[PDB]
UniProtKB/Swiss-Prot annotation, chain A:
Listed GO biological process terms: apoptotic process; biological process involved in interaction with symbiont; cellular response to UV; DNA damage response; DNA repair; ectopic germ cell programmed cell death; epigenetic programming in the zygotic pronuclei; negative regulation of apoptotic process
Name this polypeptide is given: DNA damage-binding protein 1
UniProt keyword terms in alphabetical order: Acetylation, Biological rhythms, Cytoplasm, Disease variant, DNA damage, DNA repair, DNA-binding, Host-virus interaction, Intellectual disability, Isopeptide bond, Nucleus, Phosphoprotein, Repeat, Ubl conjugation, Ubl conjugation pathway
Pfam families reported in the protein's UniProt record: Beta-prop_RSE1_1st, Beta-prop_RSE1_2nd, CPSF_A
SUPFAM superfamilies xrefs: WD40 repeat-like
Covalent link Glycyl lysine isopeptide (Lys-Gly) (interchain with G-Cter in SUMO2), residues: K782
UniProtKB/Swiss-Prot annotation, chain B:
Function: Transcription regulator of hematopoietic cell differentiation. Binds gamma-satellite DNA. Plays a role in the development of lymphocytes, B- and T-cells. Binds and activates the enhancer (delta-A element) of the CD3-delta gene. Repressor of the TDT (fikzfterminal deoxynucleotidyltransferase) gene during thymocyte differentiation. Regulates transcription through association with both HDAC-dependent and HDAC-independent complexes. Targets the 2 chromatin-remodeling complexes, NuRD and BAF (SWI/SNF), in a single complex (PYR complex), to the beta-globin locus in adult erythrocytes.
Subunit (UniProt): Heterodimer formed by the various isoforms; this modulates transcription regulator activity. Heterodimer with other IKAROS family members. Interacts with IKZF4 AND IKZF5. Component of the chromatin-remodeling NuRD repressor complex which includes at least HDAC1, HDAC2, RBBP4, RBBP7, IKZF1, MTA2, MBD2, MBD3, MTA1L1, CHD3 and CHD4. Interacts directly with the CHD4 component of the NuRD complex. Interacts directly with SMARCA4; the interaction associates IKFZ1 with the BAF complex. Interacts with SUMO1; the interaction sumoylates IKAROS, promoted by PIAS2 and PIAS3.
PTM annotation (Phosphoserine): residues: T25
Subcellular location as annotated: Nucleus
Feature type site, description Required for both pericentromeric heterochromatin localization and complete DNA binding: N16, R19
Disease field: Defects in IKZF1 are frequent occurrences (28.6%) in acute lymphoblasic leukemia (ALL). Such alterations or deletions lead to poor prognosis for ALL. Chromosomal aberrations involving IKZF1 are a cause of B-cell non-Hodgkin lymphomas (B-cell NHL). Translocation t(3;7)(q27;p12), with BCL6.
The protein's name: DNA-binding protein Ikaros
Region (Required for both high-affinity DNA binding and pericentromeric heterochromatin localization): 14-20
Effect of H24R: In CVID13; abolishes binding to DNA; has diffuse nuclear localization
Curated annotation (Swiss-Prot), chain C:
Subcellular location: Cytoplasm; Nucleus; Membrane
Family named by the database record: Belongs to the CRBN family.
Protein's gene: CRBN
The species this protein was found in: Homo sapiens (Human)
Quaternary structure annotation from Swiss-Prot or TrEMBL: Interacts with KCNT1. Component of a DCX (DDB1-CUL4-X-box) protein ligase complex, at least composed of CRBN, CUL4A, DDB1 and RBX1. Interacts directly with DDB1. Interacts (in pomalidomide-bound form) with IKZF1 and IKZF3. Interacts with ILF2. Interacts with TRAF6 and ECSIT.
Record-given protein name: Protein cereblon
Tissue and organ expression note: Widely expressed. Highly expressed in brain.
Keyword list, A-Z: Cytoplasm, Disease variant, Intellectual disability, Membrane, Metal-binding, Nucleus, Phosphoprotein, Ubl conjugation, Ubl conjugation pathway, Zinc
Post-translational modification remark: Ubiquitinated, ubiquitination is mediated by its own DCX protein ligase complex.
Membrane topology: Peripheral membrane protein
Pathway as given in its UniProt record: Protein modification; protein ubiquitination
Keyword Manganese: no
GO molecular function, one term: metal ion binding
């Protein structure tokens, strides 16, 4: 009963996987990068990366491995998607035509099983005898890598260790041995098994079971002639091989967890390691011949990069650093350190807009074309991103070196108000690095009468930053009270006051209290380059959200919705209250309607009654599920994002006979987006068929657009989707309907009420014979639809973003 | 001597027994309970 | 509130009912939303929470025959959650699986003693009377909505490894929970909400807070004595809370363990006093007096010699109670203790009993058991 259209204005930019090998040809050195649903294949050259291809997958790439079974001249690519679609693909080039062949594919889902705590694990035997998957606790799935197994038919082997933390395939074994670190009440142990395909079962591992560090997390399968494995934990790096045992406890790696690694040398003599704070180390394996055996382990701090999700060493000291929290990097490892003792020098930076935690659409140049200003990144990678359509999407970066959380725009003062957070070590606290909040032109610290420790303890300092819209310099930085957490920010006029204010909601958060018991609503005015605290109100809870409601202020305090009026004395006077029994995390408004939402999808819809001066529960829809954002498309339709990365639409249908149906929001649209939407925002990026425009920003840095379609256009485009799915060859042979089906966990239903804009737009990139196949016996305005009419329709659709 | 089927109330005369038993706020399903 | 030398496992056995009874271990469950038809006992009227034990005595021949039939087949009947006791409203109910049965011919009449256990909540689709006087009801088996972790969707693949914490140590708790929050909800920086906000919806954190608030009721409350599953823990807490019937109905309606735990924490933090139902101002006790003398928590259901079911809450102190009778060990619900009738001082209505230890070496020497149906919660 709803008709919506979703397009990707910006493709996902966060990197969640990178591999190196020989995929395009036996001689080329290829780098493969996974950006959620995109796969980018580059050829590594002395001049950097040469993009060879980019492919769209109908899934979230969770596993991506390259292997070369005996008889193959190039590497084959094994990919598993978050919905458990497995595929072995090959790279075929005919003249100038590039196409990723699908050598084999299947779905390795099990109808039963709890998804593992540590997520999906996918490994391949060094001899390419099989693929080992860890998807559910207590089971180990084996896919024999026999060329006859074109359906990727796997079998399970029971694991006696339910809490497996990591697992790898060992080198130099006559049988496909696995070494894995797991946990039990007695601590963490490294254990080895010997997989048998003939018997489809485990066998006693080569060496033995052994006890490891309490925080052992990472397993590295060292190649020949070393063999064995390296276990990396919080404080120690150990090497186990048969009876041989080695250990080191370097103090450099003790201030951050090592999360990613990569083998530098083919013989395993060098490894790259990366911590959670952007430090890049080198691990060196000193070998001595007696047969070659390991002599010692040494760790060196190569330098500092962007906070790395994955690392891969390409060649000639060049390393690609794929990051989720910041721009990906191409850096070079120098032989000798520079003046600051860093061996790492950045060569290239690849843009990454994710995570987008908030954004606002503003017409800075006032040409009638909006620009999207987003709070992207986290920690030292935090920044503002100004995105505008070019004459294809020009992006400007404003580094902040601290996490930006909320953003709003003030036309009168020509500035943005940005809530930001910086981590400070409780030394009495000191900043880790210079950041926007500390280097502001002028600054102030909250001073309100209202309201243990350790050296290594970390605390969050929250600031309101006034940033010029032209130079994007930090004009002002106001620091909030200690332990105060700034949650909401609006800029608006109130009452008869002709001034425009920045209004901030904050909660007093202490580690002792489970939920905040007191909080603040602060009203600042930015005038003549000064930020003055015009008013201050104490409330008994956390002000989770705030909105200007028809000249008044509508705030959400814990589980209450409070409407304040702005009296002549410039103070907030409570006009009315409403109690919902749910924490009003999301608070949207349209006209006199208020949408109140909870983290568990408990949606309700209130209406303000001016004559009665009170709220009334117009409608309600409670359904246990995690919810990340909501928006009001129009008076009736409400759009939200929920678990398993899917959009949903709820409809009120006030013209219902029975009062039960008048108080129910029937879900009228579901669509597996594949992205975790963080923020919704009404606006458009094109100069001002479809109605409305709601941009949304997600965790992977993707920006999408949702608009409303008429029933006729929705039916036509649904028909077009059905036509195309039979014509377009999906990579990995994943069905589009399965990809876009609502997912959750073991509970999937087909998507409805949503037109996949990307699939429609792909109609323009197919050969004319394919277009003719797609357009056949179709009805267009009835009449006999022709290829050119659909080309015109798709071209019109492409202009909304 | 008189017992209350609901609680262990004990009393001598009968009027108080009926008063208390009726005081019990409940459907007092005497049909399904008393021996 | 002396140290409990008492074997808290005693009352849960319902030794007062009689000697050993035919115990059935044949657990029976119906698939989610599976439509079923089940019988009903008109005698029972209590709100049964799944996992809570309901003891009963039946003397009427119709009920005896019905339970005899139930022993064959599944041994599962229904308990209607009467929103309004009159006219048997019964918009929701709970399946009770009979797990103990005994038969006796004392008094010259056939008598059957039963112990059932709540198994599954359900919605009543159709309630119809049979020719034998045993109502048979249509049952839509409500499901247990199990949600994944809040950060399961937003979780960096690199940090997925190391998500398993080492263990809990046998200030230390505060530091461990700070570390747990910091590590579990790190990827909360990828979203628009803080870590503590996600902690407010974390199953483990909510159970820990509930345990912290329960420990005041039992100093010997070893963790193993409380369920570790969020669903079982939530149902146990809901069964042990001294709340009115409307709140019990509300807790039964909720299908998600997270929501049940949040509502339970709200109720615990709000309710303060326990007052007389037949009055409106005579406060019989306060939450601070609630203490657990059983493995089932402070509040549990027992039967009298005439089959009436009382949900008694055990406390170490009561006020405004007029005592009647003499300490009688007969049919005492707490072995080694003698009971006496207790009435409200103002309206002289039955509120509960006072129990006194029969041995001088037994602690606590005295305490009280107040019937839930004879009390109402009072907020300040
Ligand atoms: O803990 C306890 C205390 C109360 C409870 N109870 C009753 O409500 C009750 C009512 C009448 C009773 N009589 C039946 C006839 O001859 C003696 C008096 C006995 C009880 C009794 O034990 C119980 O069974 N166990
Ligand atoms: Zn009585
Ligand atoms: Zn009274």
């Amino acid at each position: 009963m709803s008709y919506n259209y979703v397009v990707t204005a910006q493709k996902p930019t966060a990197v969640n996987g990178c591999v190196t090998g020989h995929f395009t040809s036996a001689e080329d050195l290829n780098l493969l990068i996974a950006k959620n649903t995109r796969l980018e294949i580059y050829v590594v050259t002395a001049e950097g990366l040469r993009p060879v291809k980019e492919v769209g997958m109908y899934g979230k790439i969770a596993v991506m491995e390259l292997f070369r079974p005996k008889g193959e001249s190039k590497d084959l690519l094994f990919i598993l998607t978050a919905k458990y679609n497995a595929c072995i693909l090959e790279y075929k080039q005919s003249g100038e035509s590039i196409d990723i062949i699908t050598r084999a594919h299947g779905n390795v889902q099990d109808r039963i099983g709890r998804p593992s705590e540590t997520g999906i694990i996918g490994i391949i035997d060094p001899e390419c005898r099989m693929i080992g998957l860890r998807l559910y606790d207590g089971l180990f799935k084996v896919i024999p890598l026999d060329r006859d197994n074109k359906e990727l038919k796997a079998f399970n082997i029971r694991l006696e260790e339910l809490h497996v933390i990591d697992v790898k395939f060992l080198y130099g074994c006559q049988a496909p041995t696995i070494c894995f670190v797991y946990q039990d009440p007695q601590g963490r142990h490294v254990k080895t098994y010997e997989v048998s395909l003939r018997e489809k079962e485990f066998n006693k591992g080569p060496w033995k079971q052994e006890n490891v560090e309490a925080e052992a997390s990472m397993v590295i399968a060292v190649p020949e002639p070393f063999g064995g494995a390296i276990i990396i934990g919080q404080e120690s790096i150990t090497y186990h091989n048969g009876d041989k045992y080695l250990a080191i406890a370097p103090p450099i790696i003790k201030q951050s967890t090592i999360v990613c690694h990569n083998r530098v040398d083919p013989n395993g003599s060098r490894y790259l390691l990366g911590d959670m704070e952007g430090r890049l180390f080198m691990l060196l394996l000193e070998k001595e011949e007696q047969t070659v055996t390991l002599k010692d382990l040494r760790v060196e701090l190569l330098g500092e990069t962007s906070i790395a999700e994955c690392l891969t060493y390409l060649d000639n000291g060049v390393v690609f650093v794929g990051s989720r929290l910041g721009d990906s990097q191409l850096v070079k490892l120098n032989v000798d350190s520079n003046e600051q003792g860093s061996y790492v020098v950045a060569m290239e930076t690849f843009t990454n807009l994710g995570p987008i935690v908030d954004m606002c659409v503003v017409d800075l140049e006032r040409q009638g074309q909006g620009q999207l200003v987003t709070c992207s990144g986290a920690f030292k990678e935090g920044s503002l991103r100004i995105i505008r359509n070019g004459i294809k999407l020009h992006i400007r970066t404003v580094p902040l070196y601290e996490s930006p959380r909320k953003i709003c725009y003030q036309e009168v003062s020509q500035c943005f108000g940005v809530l930001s957070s910086r981590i400070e070590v409780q030394d009495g606290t000191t900043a880790l690095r210079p950041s926007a909040s500390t280097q502001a032109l002028s600054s102030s610290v909250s001073s309100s009468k209202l309201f243990e420790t350790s050296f290594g303890e970390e605390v969050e300092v929250h600031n309101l930053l006034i940033i010029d819209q032209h130079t994007f310099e930090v004009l002002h930085a106001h620091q909030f009270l200690q332990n105060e957490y700034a949650l909401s920010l609006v800029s608006c006029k109130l009452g008869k006051d002709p001034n425009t204010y920045f209004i901030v909601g904050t909660a007093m958060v202490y580690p002792e209290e489970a939920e905040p018991k007191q909080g603040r609503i602060v009203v600042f005015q930015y005038s003549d380059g000064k930020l003055q605290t015009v008013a201050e109100k104490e409330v008994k809870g956390a002000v989770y959200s705030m909105v200007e409601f028809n000249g008044k202020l509508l705030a959400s305090i814990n589980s209450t919705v409070r409407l304040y009026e702005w009296t002549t004395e410039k103070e907030l006077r409570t006009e009315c209250n409403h109690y919902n029994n749910i924490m009003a995390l999301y608070l949207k408004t349209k006209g006199d309607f208020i949408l109140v939402g909870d983290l568990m999808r408990s949606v309700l819809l209130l209406a303000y009654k001016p004559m009665e001066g009170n709220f009334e529960e117009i409608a309600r829809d409670f359904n246990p599920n995690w919810m990340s954002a909501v928006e009001i498309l129009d008076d009736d339709n409400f759009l939200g994002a929920e678990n398993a990365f899917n959009l949903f639409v709820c409809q009120k249908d006030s013209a219902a006979t029975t009062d039960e149906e008048r108080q129910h929001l029937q879900e009228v649209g579901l669509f597996h987006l594949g992205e975790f939407v963080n923020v919704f925002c009404h606006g458009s990026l094109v100069m001002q068929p479809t109605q409305g425009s709601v941009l949304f920003g997600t965790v992977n840095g993707m920006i999408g657009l949702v608009t409303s379609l008429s029933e006729s256009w929705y039916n036509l485009l649904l028909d077009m989707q059905n036509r195309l799915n039979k014509v377009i060859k999906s990579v990995g042979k994943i069905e589009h309907s399965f990809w876009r089906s609502f997912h959750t966990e073991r509970k999937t239903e087909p998507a409805t009420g949503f037109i996949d804009g990307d699939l429609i737009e792909s109609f323009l990139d197919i050969s004319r014979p394919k277009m003719q196949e797609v357009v056949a016996n179709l009805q267009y305005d009835k009449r006999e639809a022709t290829a050119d009419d659909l080309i015109k329709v798709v071209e019109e659709l492409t202009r909304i973003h | 001597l008189l017992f209350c089927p609901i609680c262990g109330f004990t009393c001598r005369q009968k009027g108080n027994l009926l008063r208390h038993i009726n005081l019990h706020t409940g459907e007092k399903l005497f049909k399904y309970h008393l021996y | 509130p002396n140290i409990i030398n008492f074997d808290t496992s005693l009352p849960t056995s319902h030794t007062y009912l009689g000697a050993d009874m035919e115990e059935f271990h044949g657990r029976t469950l119906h698939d989610d939303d599976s439509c079923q038809v089940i019988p009903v006992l008109p005698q029972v009227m209590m709100i049964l929470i799944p996992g809570q034990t309901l003891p009963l005595q039946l003397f009427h021949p119709q009920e005896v025959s019905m339970v005899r039939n139930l022993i064959q087949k599944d041994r599962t009947f229904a308990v209607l959650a009467y929103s309004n006791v009159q006219e048997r409203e019964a918009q929701f109910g709970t399946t009770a699986e009979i797990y103990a049965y005994r038969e006796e011919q004392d008094f010259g009449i056939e008598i059957v003693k039963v112990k059932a256990i709540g198994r599954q909540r359900f919605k009543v689709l159709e309630l119809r009377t049979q020719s034998d006087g045993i109502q048979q009801a249509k049952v839509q088996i409500l499901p247990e909505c199990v949600l994944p972790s809040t950060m399961s969707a937003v979780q960096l693949e690199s940090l997925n490894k190391c998500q398993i914490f080492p263990s809990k140590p046998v200030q230390c708790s505060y530091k461990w929970w700070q570390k747990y929050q910091k590590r579990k909800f790190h990827c909360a920086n990828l979203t628009s909400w803080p870590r503590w906000l996600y902690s407010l919806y974390d199953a483990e954190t909510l159970m820990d807070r509930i345990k912290k608030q329960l420990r005041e009721w039992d100093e010997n409350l070893k963790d193993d004595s409380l369920p570790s599953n969020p669903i079982d823990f939530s149902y146990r807490v809901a069964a042990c809370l001294p709340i009115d019937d409307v709140l019990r109905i509300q807790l039964l309606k909720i299908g998600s363990a997270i929501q049940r735990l949040r509502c339970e924490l709200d109720i615990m933090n709000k309710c303060t006093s326990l007052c007389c139902k037949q009055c409106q101002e005579t406060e019989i006790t306060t939450k601070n007096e609630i203490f657990s003398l059983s493995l089932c928590g402070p509040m549990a259901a027992y039967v009298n010699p005439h089959g009436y079911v009382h949900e008694t809450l055990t406390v170490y102190k009561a006020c405004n109670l007029n005592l009647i009778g003499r300490p009688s060990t007969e049919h005492s619900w707490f072995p080694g203790y003698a009971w006496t009738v207790a009435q409200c001082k103002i309206c002289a209505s039955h509120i509960g009993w006072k129990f006194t230890a029969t041995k001088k070496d037994m602690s606590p020497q005295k305490f009280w058991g107040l019937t839930r149906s004879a009390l109402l919660p009072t907020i300040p």
